Write a protein that binds this ligand. Structure first.
Ligand SMILES: CO[C@H]1CN(c2nc(-c3ncnn3C)c(C(=O)O)s2)CC[C@H]1NC(=O)c1[nH]c(C)c(Cl)c1Br
Ligand SMILES: CO[C@H]1CN(c2nc(-c3ncnn3C)c(C(=O)O)s2)CC[C@H]1NC(=O)c1[nH]c(C)c(Cl)c1Br
Ligand SMILES: [Ca+2]
Lengths: 183, 184
């Protein structure tokens, strides 16, 4: 299963240093940029929290919550089975929280060391989107301290490569804030 | 026109240093990764030539050559007018750009001199499909026109991890350094 990603993370992520750690962000954001390229999402909100987690929210269709043919929710399939590779982020995170807005309601789905909890439905909403919050594993990673400048330069490039998409970045450690949107 | 991209390159690529120079590669490759995400291309070949140019080839549908609804060819539109396709910026910041497109049973040639198109030369029949882009970054615009192999390799490796199953090949013709990035 995902123990393969934990045994040899280089084969899925590259390294376990600062580049591999930042790759977790590139992976989650890339999935949202793909939803924007698909013609559904218009913005990506990235938040570096003081607790060591990174939250990425989009206004896309939202990851399907309906039960897959594999006898588990589609979100659990996405998050647990190995161009979507967010299961690798899950595998290398002590915790991951998925908040999905679709089918007229808000949906909650957490993972403890990649192990799913129950899918909690609650609170009706007309809005759509996917929220992913993950806590990178300190045992796997050489460092779990994200660099604001690194995330900003990359998120700016993504905004240049996908003209018209809005990418917002907030570092809740210092209140540093950036908005990247281009013609 | 594209003189706006040349007057303020930063407003279209960020900077004119090492990052902005490497961004030209990210831009061309991103368009090919998009053709792979679309379900047509399976590989991207990147070549850092000794002359200062970068060549990016894919096996996608190929940029349409047919006369566009608004004057000049669909490629001339792509390359000269400012969806998530921004190659016209690479053209604008390059002294030269060569486009080789394989589609509609033939091989197609289209070059640009400081973004100004030449004629579209049709020649040689081919069953194969794809887009080839070779560009010479402008030394007047850029602080440096020397590409770093390690920089291109780390980024092309990331792209291969983000798009599992896509093959990305890199060759640096200045030293013969070669890399193949393909993952599960
Ligand atoms: C894998 O989910 C992606 C595709 N999604 C859908 N696919 C289908 C579908 N097409 C065919 N059959 N089906 C069931 C839908 C439907 O019919 O309703 S919706 C929408 C959400 C997407 N993911 C993200 O935006 C995303 N965002 C972040 C931050 C991460 Cl991380 C991810 Br991953
Ligand atoms: C901008 O063209 C892109 C889309 N292309 C097509 N689109 C349509 C289409 N669908 C709807 N209407 N039309 C006309 C086609 C058709 O059906 O005939 S083909 C395929 C090639 C693509 N570009 C690249 O692969 C590409 N590669 C590199 C290295 C760079 Cl740089 C670029 Br840009
Ligand atoms: Ca030659």
């Amino acid at each position: 299963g995902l123990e393969a990603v934990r045994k040899r993370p280089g084969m899925y992520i590259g390294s376990t240093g600062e580049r591999g750690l930042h790759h977790l962000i590139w992976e989650v954001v890339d999935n949202a940029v793909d939803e924007a390229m698909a013609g559904f999402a218009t913005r990506v909100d990235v938040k570096i929290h003081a607790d060591g987690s990174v939250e990425v929210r989009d206004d896309g269709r939202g990851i399907p919550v309906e039960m897959h043919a594999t006898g588990m929710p589609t979100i659990d399939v996405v998050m647990t089975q190995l161009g979507v590779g967010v299961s690798v982020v899950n595998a290398l995170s002590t915790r991951l929280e998925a908040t999905v807005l679709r089918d007229g309601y808000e949906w909650f789905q957490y993972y403890d060391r990649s192990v799913p909890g129950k899918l909690k439905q609650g609170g009706e909403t007309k809005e759509t989107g996917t929220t992913i919050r993950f806590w990178a594993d300190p045992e796997i990673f050489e460092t779990t301290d994200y660099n604001f400048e690194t995330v900003a330069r990359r998120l700016q490039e993504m905004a240049f490569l996908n003209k018209g998409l809005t990418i917002e970045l907030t570092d809740e450690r210092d209140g540093k804030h950036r908005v990247f949107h281009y013609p």
